[PDB]
């Protein structure tokens, strides 16, 4: 089955460049274009470029010309978007996508996230929330750049930044008999800082 | 970059409603070369219709397109849950494709009051100098709340950090997260915190509290 898996969520500098990738699998790589967009939170989305791997050609909206570069590489089934000169409004997420019947988007990779700050990588502080079904839950604080996954042993909350540091919070409902008896943890997890956190939530006193 | 405009922006429907969205092209665009996608939150759009009418695979027979010209429209029979997403136009007859601003979609439901539950700050964060109060307002339609953080009886505005789900999967309603942070010293120097939600299910306030002295 076709498939477009992209590079990672990545936070870069204001002023420098970075470069994701597209890998292709499950369909003859040359006989197909890939498309590139950016869509800001909120918004539709705006198409940069194509690349064309069968003859290397790219083709870009006249207001990406000279910030992108699309390429691709044969031999790997990957196509590569460099953005460079890189500002706050280049944060986005971006997709790349197949061009099908009549310039139909028929599958989606699963987009890249480009955070553009001069904000410093933080890991988060995190924090249990104790007090017949119980409400607990973990206040996950402080860290730079999103994102985090939260897993216990449920509601988990988008993050709000506030002075370069997200906030975010997620909430497990269990039955009485478990928790304090039980030990309850919620599992945090910051992949750019390459960091985790076991949080047991701890009863107060 | 041929505009295109689709209405309405933002629109609910019921389970079993009719729907019908609209987008208008401020210029004419081969049916050929229009197409819809669907979009949920979180994950990357996904085809939906091509080419005016054609379901792409996967897509249920509830769904149709039509159109020509510069007026093309998706229609949805009867409205399920997993139907609630932002909808989206593309025309490719021209490059630079473009595509429409989106059609949100959501699922109305009878309203549901909210389940309310208060945290303290926990020692390890006052530890480090600070002091966050949390309060979750679980499971409530519709979304609109009014989330009031009260200080010894005396309302406190600043330092409040508000985020929504978008709505649940299952029984399409919202939960909120409502994070008051002070200082450790701030804190320290008050008894009793309370959050308190305002919503339309309620003709009073849904309360709750802690003290310093429990
Ligand atoms: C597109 O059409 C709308 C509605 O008639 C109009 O007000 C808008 O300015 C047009 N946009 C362009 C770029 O011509």
């Known amino acids: 089955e076709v498939k477009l898996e992209e590079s990672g969520p990545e936070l870069v500098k204001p002023g420098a460049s970075m470069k994701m990738s597209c890998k292709a699998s499950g369909y003859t790589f040359t006989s197909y274009i890939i498309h590139w967009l950016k869509q800001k939170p909120g918004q539709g989305l705006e198409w940069i470029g194509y690349i064309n791997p069968y003859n290397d050609g790219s083709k870009y909206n006249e207001k990406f010309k000279g910030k992108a570069t699309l390429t691709s590489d044969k031999s790997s089934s990957t196509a590569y978007m460099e953005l460079s000169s890189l500002a706050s409004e280049d944060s986005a997420v971006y997709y790349c996508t197949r061009n099908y019947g009549s310039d139909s988007l028929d599958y989606w990779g699963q987009g890249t996230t480009l955070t553009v700050s001069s904000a410093k990588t933080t890991p988060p502080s995190v924090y249990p929330l104790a007090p017949s079904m119980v409400t607990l839950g973990c206040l996950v604080k402080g860290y730079f750049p999103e994102p985090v996954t939260v897993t216990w042993n449920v509601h988990t909350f988008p993050a709000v930044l506030q002075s370069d540091l997200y906030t975010l919070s997620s909430s497990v409902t269990v039955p009485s008999s478990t928790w304090p008896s039980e030990t309850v943890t919620c599992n945090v997890a910051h992949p750019a800082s390459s960091t985790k956190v076991d949080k047991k939530i701890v009863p107060r006193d | 970059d041929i505009v295109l405009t689709q209405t309405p922006a933002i629109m609910s429907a019921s389970l079993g409603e009719r729907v019908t969205m609209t987008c208008t092209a401020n210029s004419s665009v081969s049916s050929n070369y229009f197409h819809w996608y669907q979009q949920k939150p979180g994950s990357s759009p996904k085809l939906w219709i091509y080419s005016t009418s054609n379901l792409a695979s996967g897509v249920p027979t509830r769904f149709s397109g039509s159109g020509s010209g510069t007026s093309y429209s998706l229609t949805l029979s009867s409205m399920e849950a997993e139907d609630a997403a932002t909808y989206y136009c593309?025309?490719?007859?021209?490059?630079?494709?473009?595509f429409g601003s989106g059609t949100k979609l959501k699922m109305k439901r009878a309203d549901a009051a909210p389940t309310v539950s208060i945290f303290p700050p926990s020692s390890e964060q006052l530890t480090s100098g600070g002091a966050s109060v949390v309060c979750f307002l679980n499971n409530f339609y519709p979304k609109d709340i009014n989330v009031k953080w009260k200080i010894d009886g005396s309302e406190r505005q600043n330092g409040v950090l508000n985020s929504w789900t978008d709505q649940d999967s299952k029984d399409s309603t919202y939960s909120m997260s409502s994070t008051l942070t002070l200082t450790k010293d701030e804190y320290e120097r008050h008894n009793s915190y309370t959050c308190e939600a305002t919503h339309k299910t309620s003709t009073s306030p849904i309360v709750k509290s802690f003290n310093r002295n429990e």
């Open positions: 593309h025309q490719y007859h021209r490059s630079p494709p473009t």
